Amino acid sequence: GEAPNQALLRILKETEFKKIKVLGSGAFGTVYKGLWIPEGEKVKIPVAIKELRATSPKANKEILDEAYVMASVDNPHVCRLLGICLTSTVQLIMQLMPFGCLLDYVREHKDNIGSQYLLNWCVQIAKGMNYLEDRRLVHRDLAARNVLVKTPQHVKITDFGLAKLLGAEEKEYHAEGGKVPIKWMALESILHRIYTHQSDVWSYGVTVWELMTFGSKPYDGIPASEISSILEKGERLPQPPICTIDVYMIMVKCWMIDADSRPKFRELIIEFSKMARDPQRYLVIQGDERMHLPDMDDVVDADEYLI
Template identity: 40%
Template sequence: MKLNLLPISHVCTEDGEKPMVLLPYMNWGNLKLFLRQCKLAEANNPQAISQQDLVHMAIQIACGMSYLARREVIHKDLAARNCVIDDSMQVKITDNALARDLFPMDYHCLGDNENRPVRWMALESLLNNDFSSASDVWAFGVTLWELMTLGQTPYVDIDPFEMAAYLKDGYRIAQPINCPDELFAVMACCWALDPEERPKFQQLVQCLTEFHAALGAYV
């Protein structure tokens, strides 16, 4: 859904000046930082954020990515750090290049002078620099894992230079604590080695929407 993409409101390109971009204000800011604040708050208030809230965020991200995929736009850097959120829990996808400055530890140079979000990348992207909507789906699976862990770093114990071999051998990040099996199964589908075997974003929207409704039935 286009609503889940952060639009550029205005651009200023005056001669001799650095270009400036004006973006809508999202008062809870960067999603990764928001999730980490929720984790800190959880120690005092276990109900600070519900599983339903987190799944609702995932649905919004999947909707935004589905919109991009239908228009054959590849994001290449989908992650919680490249999403923003407001006080009504509305999430929008962005990629304003600031993530590399705000979260330098999320990017690694593999010897070719190009910083990449290695821990979010599909195997074919790591090996062959091959990006597609299917590689965005892989990154979505990692983003969903970030949501369920309230902003933890994936594959934190794996050397970035070893990521490709680690993934090729079939290893993946572990199921988060308190993450339902059904939700972890969605993540696992996103990490299929064969890009053709990964779900499409519209399928993810449907699956997560049904899971969200099921959660609501028990609350």
């Protein structure tokens, strides 16, 4: 029942790209801002380069798994892997997203973020997630931190590090114990290590909550061990001040105990899209009207660089 995965994995010469400056640091890897020039193509492509420290064979296995997933996705609302460089250190080359992660963007820019941007971001994430479902991909780590901003107008889902691809036959994926973001997790996943597209939907609800609260941490001041019981009791994240009941009810649905009664991503696209048509009706934000948000000769965005 499973179709062949015919995605190309592109191997890139080290010489083809130059790191310009560091973006983020981890012992495991450091992401770099960079320029990519395909050999003799006359284009420059802004990129983010993730290269691992001097690191374990296991570390190299995980990075390759990430590369496999990223190579296999092509959607406007998903980040895609441009290629990999097989140096002494393995490097993932990705499209640069100039405005960084969405979680940082909302926190930084709250005073200038209108209802239209929020509702639109919600539609875009739903579109990306729906695409992943079409691809039978369960992301397993959806969060504001894992959404990137190409422009304030355009966002893409990222971080396929925990991402798992379902067999056509099998709905659910059962996970060996590993470090997890409980606060974004569905209850069934927390209790049983069970992940589904519907479980992704619970995560989406939390992500929406994060955007509506302009980057607040969910269940702040509460230990992860506690969270499972709290949900069991029936506690849920509080309605955000900007949110109307219409928006909030959607989040609540995402957090329902019965996974099937939760909304489909395709539905989420429809509902948010209607709201986006008249944003002030569904999100109440002070001063909504006033706010506005944002050799290079041969530079081309990755989205415009095809094969």
